[PDB]
Amino acid sequence: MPHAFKPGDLVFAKMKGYPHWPARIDDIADGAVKPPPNKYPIFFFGTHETAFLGPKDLFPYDKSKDKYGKPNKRKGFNEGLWEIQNNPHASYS
Numbered sequence: 852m853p854h855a856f857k858p859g860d861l862v863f864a865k866m867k868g869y870p871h872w873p874a875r876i877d878d879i880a881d882g883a884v885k886p887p888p889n890k891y892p893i894f895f896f897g898t899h900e901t902a903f904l905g906p907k908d909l910f911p912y913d914k915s916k917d918k919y920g921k922p923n924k925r926k927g928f929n930e931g932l933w934e935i936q937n938n939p940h941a942s943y944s
Contacts, residue, residue, distance in 0.1 A: 856876050856891055856906060856909060857876065858876050858877060858878040859875065859876065859878075859881075859940060860875065860876040860911070861873075861874075861875050861907045861911075861912035861913075861939050862874050862875065862876065862893070862910055862911060862912055862915075862937055863909075863910045863915045863916075863919040863920075864893045864895065864902075864904055864908055864909055864910075865908040865909075865910070866902065866904070866908065870919070870923050870925060870928070871872070871910060871911070871918075871919040871926065872895050872896075872897075872898075872917070872928065872931065873895070873896040873897065873919075873920070873928075873932055873934065873935035874893050874894055874895045874896060874931075874935075875893070875894050875896070875930040875935070875939055875940075876891050876893065876894075876909075877891075877892040877893065877894040877901065878892075879892055886903040887903055888906060889905055889908075890903040890905055891903065891904060891905070891909070894913075894943070895907070895927075896927075896928065896930070896932070896933065896934040896935045896939070896943075897926075897927030897928055897929070897930035897931025897932070897933075897934060898926070898927035898931065898932030899927075899943050912935065918944075920932060920935075920936075
């Protein structure tokens with residue numbers, strides 16, 4: 852059975868006006884800004900942007916990749932597909 856989301860989990864993350872996007876649940880570094888309550892820090896592959904999202908917008912990668920893991924015109928997306936498949940836990944600073 853599923854657990855709660857934890858840092859390192861791989862997802863497609865959905866925001867308004869964008870396709871479901873390859874992403875990970877990030878850790879929060881010591882001294883870094885924490886997310887609001889009930890929100891997780893989402894690192895978006897390819898763009899390397901962070902947003903704060905709730906579970907309603909987070910689709911586990913394994914289950915969802917056959918639907919969402921296809922090339923997209925949007926800037927950073929295909930780069931994001933490479934990262935999530937090939938080095939999803941690397942530092943992208």
